[PDB]
Amino acid sequence: MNNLYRDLAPVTEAAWAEIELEAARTFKRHIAGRRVVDVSDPGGPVTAAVSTGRLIDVKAPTNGVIAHLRASKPLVRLRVPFTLSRNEIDDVERGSKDSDWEPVKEAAKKLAFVEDRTIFEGYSAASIEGIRSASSNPALTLPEDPREIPDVISQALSELRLAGVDGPYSVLLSADVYTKVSETSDHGYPIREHLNRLVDGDIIWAPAIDGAFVLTTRGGDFDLQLGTDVAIGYASHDTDTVRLYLQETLTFLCYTAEASVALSH
Template sequence: MDYLAREGAPIAPALWEKIDAAVIDNAKKHMVARRFLSLYGPLGPGASVVAVDSAAKDEALENGVGRITGRRLVELPQLYEDFSLLWRDLEEAQRMGYPVDLSAPAAAAQRAAKREDELILFGSQALGMEGLMNASGAFQIKRGDWRTGEDAYKDVAHGIAYLSSNSMLGRYALVLSPEVYLNLQRLVPNVGLLELDRIAKLVDGRVYPAGPYGAGKAVLVCAEPQYMDLAVGADLAVGYLEQKDLNHYFRILETVALRLKEPKAVVVFE
């Protein structure tokens, strides 16, 4: 089934290729969580839920009946952004022989990337989902003043010490709100390094500024797939919605969910 409704759409294959490239390229530039999370899937566009197993997963057998414990099911919500291309613009581009302006799909891809990161980092109250920044069971560290001194370095080192002491070793990643990231772009006296560069050495360079999701946000994770990953049903794709008033309407969509299997692999700096 062509769920993206592309086969019968009045869009030339060459233009579809350019739209796809504009969407994927711009989404990759702005997606943050996919830079450190492993992907689980794609499971297919029809997948509506995905299992999240904890370390305590087991099969309980009793009185001839077996059931799996330590497992919960999480919905794979659809995330989408729409855009349009005006028929007059397409006709003029074809007549004059110049490229179609793909600013609209590029901007929609940027919004789609922001929506995905927001779901992963902060969850969704409407969907009953938690994100990395507000996960129940995450380790909380009261952070010092990251604008001066060495509090930032000490706090991140504290977080890594906590993770390693709980045998959570592997790929550490630090996600910061933009102003926190910029506050670390300062020289440390008598060291000759930026504070950000010192911290980056602790996490093998995996420090990521997130989008505009609120001020003063910082989270450290051990991003190994046994602790967390990103479940993907339908990966980011472009579908054709309709032709209305001769103009063409499209939808960028995906179905994804954060699978946080071990909340102790998350350190939130408050």
Template sequence: MDYLSREAAPFGDALWEQIDTTIVETLKKYLVGRRFLPLYGPLGPGAQSVAVDSSDKDESFKDGVVQTTGRKFVELVQLYEDFPLFWRDLEASERTGVPVDLSAAARAAQASAKAEDQLIFFGNKALGVDGLLTVPGSNTIKMDDWAEGQNAFANIAAGASMLVEKDMLGRLALIMGPDLYFKLQRIQPGTGVMEIDRIKSLLDGRVYRSNALAGKAVLVCAEAQYMDLAIGQDLAAAYLELVNLNHYFRILETAALRVKNSEAIVVFE
């Protein structure tokens, strides 16, 4: 089954290649969660849920029945973003050789990237899905004013120490909103060093900013035994429909954040 319906589109592989290239290059610029989270999958477009095992997963045997404990199943959430290409633009490109303007595809890809990051950081309340900042059992640290003194470095160092003390060992990654990120673009008095550079040195360079996080920051131990991003259908463009002679497309994916140990997360509040 061609669930992407590409064969229904009244144009050839050359345009699809341009669309795919535009989408992929845009996603590379704007996806943030995939830069630090391990990936699990792709599991395929038909996968609708995925198991999340906690550290105390076990099996019990009784009366010829095996029961698995410490395991739950979460939905692979379907995310999508639509965009159009107008028939006159395609005709003009075919007749004159002028490249098709794929700005609409790039904008949709950018929105898709933000939607995935929103799912990773905040989950989806309506679906009962948790994100890194909403999952129960995570650690919290009161955020001081990161525009003043060494507050940011002190908060982040305290968070890193907290994770290490809990034996959450591995790659530490800090993700914050752009407002916080730009507050750190200053010379720390008496050191001659940018505050952001001190923090990057502490975390081996794994510092990221995401437009999905406004005024918020989170520190994680991004190892697969603690968390990962499960992918069913990876981000791809499908042909949606023909309306008023114009062509409509859909960028879609199915994904789920799997937090296996919420103690590997520090939320700065």
């Protein structure tokens, strides 16, 4: 066995398949960073840090010796526990098609939100600087009126052009901004269509992030190093409930500071 004690869980194979399907569907639906950043292959449970290739000055041990520490970025393991009714798990085998997988969906959405906020807004406790802070380009402010959002999007694209970066550009919108651009139409077209016409990439729904992000998907700028991908593990169970969790180990590294523009307000 491995650390996910799934064999110890009182969950059937059919219920396991349904739970995995629900978690994967929700995570894919609510994730936005993986669509733009480079996702490394999982390094395995052993992997604990990613080498940045740099050196840190440290006080030599003896005279006449120059000592340097090898810099690295630690992976963080993020775990989202959730509990399931054993009645629904048992109902799956009985042919039930509407088992209550809401805790799975909530946990998957929470994990996706944490991952996206880590990639974009950063996670200081994990020594991760997000795309917003690492952006050397000036930060714009989203206007209140949705019809003026294409203006600031064009301004951000102009800033990226002045930064000399190439490759397809993708716009990431928060839930509020995405809703505003979708529900507002101009010239018989929603504002989201205007934004999609502006860039050759795609308009990404990013409910976890704040404001908006404009960045290039040429590759080699944003790296999401994965220790292990999203997995479902088992914690404990009662006679009527099972306590599972969703966990993953990752770090995010930004290499190019001028490859993104961050918008707020």
